């Protein structure tokens, strides 16, 4: 039936303006209030504001000074403007149709609503410029063994853009191996970690390398992860 | 803490009743009607309840919500597997916005309750040798897949520099997760110890590493 669709850049340099357009179909913009709601990954949902078809607006007071929305009846489209963006604006951005209480008071539309949502679009805020990662050893457990096994990994840090692939033992060990998801730091730069659970015997040996590939910056890196030293 | 409060996590056995509670105040729920959302990861949020207790058509009864006082509650009867998702409540708040609760992860109990398994690596020398530091806290083999991480310095609650991943499913159908505390070698040395603090289902284990080991 009525479907909305987010569009706009996927990557945006801090301090610049973020822009997005919601495109509506199957129905008219007319007679509805409409909203952008964002979601930083792994976080929950924050409402940005709403715009009434006739153009009146209301912006979340925390963002008001940075935010701007507009409605284009002809194109059947509405849109957002986030200004002076920073690390914190990295989110999936959804557009939505609203519902709620109306007052003739002067308080107008109280938004309680959202019954209709776009699929959302991810927007990444970053100045970072295609650095390859620096690969560091995760000091193997060392000293003390209850349960009976030990754990180690790699720390891949400060890179852009994702992804990266972490292999192990050039490919020989794929069991009890968790590659954690790529976190994004207030730098503009990604980091993740791989980890394999292994027998507390001893070690060494065996050994036990990481095959980190930053394919966008042609950086293949093997890394020897050798125990305690304590 | 948020304007609306929900339990980070809730669990029940396929077929059991469950209840999620949204908690607020005169500023919001005492004065506007709440709505409820199911969100499956990677998909957008989907409206479950509106006007405290109305149900948009296409939503199963067995999904019911209600408001009492400045609180609201979502109730899910006859649990299923596709019911496993994150649930949000929302309303207008006197502060002049729509507001959501923090989001309750509802886990439908497939296996039994696995307490998390915590390991904390101290900043590696080879990192320090390039004048940087990072502490890496890895959490393991837990179910339901839902943890809260805290970090303390000697015993100082630090919030800043933290980065935690959302729980990921393991090969063994259990959950992993990782936090990372960034610093400068000044800091790592300026304290006799740092801690990682994991609450799971209401129970906290921790590991504590210090600059001095060798």
């Amino acid at each position: 039936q009525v479907q909305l669709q987010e569009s706009g850049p996927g990557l945006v340099k801090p301090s610049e303006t973020l822009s997005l357009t919601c495109t509506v179909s199957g129905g008219s913009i007319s007679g509805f209030h409409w909203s952008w709601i964002r979601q930083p990954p792994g976080k929950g949902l924050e409402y940005i504001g709403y715009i009434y078809y006739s153009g009146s607006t209301s912006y979340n007071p925390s963002l008001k000074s940075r935010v701007s929305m507009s409605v284009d009846t002809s194109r059947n489209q509405f849109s957002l403007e986030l200004s002076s963006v920073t690390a914190a604006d990295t989110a999936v951005y959804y557009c939505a149709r609203d519902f709620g209480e109306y007052h003739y008071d002067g308080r107008g539309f109280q938004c309680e609503g959202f019954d209709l949502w776009g699929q959302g679009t991810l927007v990444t805020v970053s100045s970072a410029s295609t650095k390859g990662p620096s690969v560091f050893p995760l000091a193997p457990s060392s000293k003390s063994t209850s349960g009976g096994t030990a754990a180690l990994g790699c720390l891949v840090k400060d890179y852009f853009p994702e992804p990266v692939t972490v292999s192990w033992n050039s490919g020989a060990l794929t069991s009890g191996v968790h590659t954690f998801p790529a976190v994004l730091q207030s730098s503009g730069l990604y980091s993740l970690s791989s980890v394999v659970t292994v027998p507390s015997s001893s070690l060494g040996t065996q050994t036990y390398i990481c095959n980190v590939n930053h394919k966008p910056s042609n950086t293949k890196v093997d890394k020897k992860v050798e125990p305690k030293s304590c | 803490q948020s304007v609306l409060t929900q339990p980070p996590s809730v669990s029940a056995a396929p077929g059991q009743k469950v209840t999620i509670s949204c908690s607020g105040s005169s500023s919001n729920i005492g004065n506007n009607m709440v709505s409820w959302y199911q969100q499956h990861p990677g998909t957008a949020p989907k409206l479950l309840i509106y006007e405290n207790s109305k149900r948009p058509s296409g939503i199963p009864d067995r999904f019911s919500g209600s408001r009492s006082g400045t609180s609201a509650t979502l109730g899910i009867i006859g649990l299923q597997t596709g019911d496993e998702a994150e649930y949000y409540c929302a309303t207008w708040d006197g502060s002049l916005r729509t507001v959501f609760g923090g989001g309750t992860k509802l886990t439908v109990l497939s296996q039994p309750k696995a307490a998390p398994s915590v390991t904390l690596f101290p900043p590696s020398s080879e990192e320090l040798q390039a004048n940087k530091a990072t502490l890496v806290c890895l959490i393991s083999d837990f179910y339901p897949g839902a943890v809260t991480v805290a970090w303390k310095a000697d015993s100082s609650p630090v919030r800043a520099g933290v980065e935690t991943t959302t729980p990921s499913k393991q090969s063994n159908n259990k959950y992993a997760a990782s936090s990372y505390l960034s610093l400068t070698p000044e800091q790592w040395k300026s304290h006799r110890s740092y801690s990682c603090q994991v609450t799971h289902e209401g129970s906290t284990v921790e590991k504590t590493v210090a600059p001095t080991e060798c």
Partner: peptide
């Protein structure tokens, strides 16, 4: 307090006004 008019989901609504003027 007083109050009212719930716009339900997917129900159109039209105001302008605002009876006291702009």
């Amino acid at each position: 307090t007083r109050k009212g008019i719930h716009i339900g989901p997917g129900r159109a609504f039209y105001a302008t006004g605002q009876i006291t003027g702009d």
